[PDB]
């Protein structure tokens, strides 16, 4: 019953820092590496499934999440914060967009909505910031493909390619080396896999790696035929098997 801390828990310090936002960023550093690479005809988001137990079933925990049929997200930092951000993000895409315009939000707008949700946790009374950074990749008719990073402060930035979390500094270097503007999606998935191998401690296979693409429309994933102007999701989670095929040619 009733909150006592109706004041901001993120305040400015004598030097101009916002401590809690700094400390959430330090949490993102401690988290498992995730990355995004933009190609000419798609985006790839990838991360490692770091398991709590060998007795756990890692298929039941998705780090990669569909946000709308053409937008997907991955994170580094505190898992549960991600999970609830994903719920709010899906809802907001409906309440603030689809229920109004009859179509799904373009990438930047949804990212902007997510940013707002995180911005608020930085200003409101009696809350800490979210302990995550997200990578949001998507497609829309008028903007093409995009990749955005969203930070605990509420800040977002568009990226050609980037990595967040543990090995992020080395992985970002490995991406500046490898990225160009002629990359096909298949090349990008291949680079994503290479970059992720430096980060992975243990086994590196389709069971321990999580990887999704924003590529082309998947009419077989639509669930109905008949309406010719509805072609299906561009978001697609690659299977364990699919990953392994690209590791034997890696």
């Amino acid at each position: 019953m009733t909150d006592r801390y109706s004041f901001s828990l993120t305040t400015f310090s004598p030097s101009g820092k916002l401590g809690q936002i700094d400390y959430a960023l330090t949490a993102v550093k401690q988290g498992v590496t995730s990355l995004g690479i933009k190609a000419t005809n798609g985006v790839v988001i990838a991360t490692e499934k770091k398991s709590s137990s060998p007795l756990a079933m890692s298929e039941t925990l998705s780090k990669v999440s569909l946000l709308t049929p053409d937008i997907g997200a991955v994170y580094s930092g505190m898992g549960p914060d991600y999970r609830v951000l994903v719920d709010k993000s899906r809802k907001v895409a409906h309440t603030s967009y689809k229920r109004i315009y009859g179509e799904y939000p373009p990438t930047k707008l949804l990212v902007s909505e997510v940013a707002k949700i995180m911005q608020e946790a930085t200003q409101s009374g009696g809350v800490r910031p979210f302990g995550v950074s997200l990578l949001i990749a998507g497609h829309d008719e008028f903007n093409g493909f995009s990749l955005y990073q969203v930070d605990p402060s509420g800040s977002y930035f568009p990226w050609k390619a980037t990595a967040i979390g543990k090995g992020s500094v080395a992985a970002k270097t490995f991406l500046e080396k490898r990225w160009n503007d002629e990359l096909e999606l298949e090349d990008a998935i291949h680079i994503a896999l290479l970059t992720l191998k430096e980060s992975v401690e243990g086994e590196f296979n389709g069971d321990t790696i999580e990887l999704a693409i924003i590529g082309d429309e998947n009419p077989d994933l639509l669930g109905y035929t008949g309406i010719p102007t509805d072609k299906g999701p561009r978001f697609r989670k690659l299977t364990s098997q699919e990953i392994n095929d690209r590791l034997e040619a890696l």
């Binding site: 899906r90 809802k91 109905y224």
Partner: protein
């Protein structure tokens, strides 16, 4: 309006005519009364046209969010439960009458919902001003365990009873087929037996026929 619902051995079929009316005047000669709640749950509405579209889209929206949240294919009983609870709340004032049909992990389902929030279940259903015309066809030809083809023929024939005998209905027959294994198939203008005959004369006017007072080019951008 004529909307029907027919269960067969491995699924469920819904169908509808394609006439919208403001009183005696036909507004749209070929609209679509078959709507999607989710990929495999489909809906047909009669009564207030804006109401059946809106209640369908709202519940559709929520069903998608549920599906994503629970990591499961949407069920027909969820659509039915949300619709009836919503309609009931609005005591009737949302004049949505619906035949909701679909397939989900638990089999195949066919339901009716009335505006005040009551639901019924059945093997064959009809709603609309053409409801009686259709039902007499349905009561004449329905049997247990229809093959897909028979169910489409029956549902199609029922919409025709509505089209030919009810002034509230006309034009074309839309169909949607939901089978347990497969993707749902939407079949736009499955029948078109009401083609306007070619007119007796062309009415295109000689240019300059219309007196014009003044004129100007209009700016679109900035």
């Amino acid at each position: 309006t004529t909307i029907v619902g027919v269960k067969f051995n491995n699924g469920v079929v819904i169908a509808a005519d394609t006439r919208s009316t403001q009183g005696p005047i036909v507004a749209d000669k070929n609209c679509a009364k078959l709507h999607r709640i989710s990929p495999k749950i489909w809906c047909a509405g009669a009564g207030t046209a804006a109401d059946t579209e809106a209640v369908t889209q709202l519940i559709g929206s929520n069903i998608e969010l549920h599906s994503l949240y629970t990591s499961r294919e949407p069920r027909v009983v969820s659509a039915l439960q949300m619709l009836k609870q919503h309609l009931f709340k609005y005591q009737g004032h949302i004049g949505a009458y619906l035949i909701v049909a679909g397939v989900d992990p638990t089999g195949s389902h066919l339901f009716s919902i009335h505006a005040h929030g009551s639901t019924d279940v059945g093997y064959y259903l009809s709603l609309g001003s053409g409801s009686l015309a259709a039902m007499a066809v349905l009561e004449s030809h329905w049997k247990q365990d229809l093959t897909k083809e028979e169910a489409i023929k029956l549902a199609s024939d029922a919409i025709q009873a509505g089209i030919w005998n009810d002034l509230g209905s006309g034009s074309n027959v839309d169909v949607c087929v939901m089978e347990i294994g497969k993707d749902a198939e939407y079949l736009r203008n499955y029948l078109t037996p009401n083609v306007r005959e070619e007119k007796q004369k062309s009415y295109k006017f000689p240019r300059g026929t219309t007196a014009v007072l003044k004129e100007s080019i209009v700016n679109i951008c900035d």
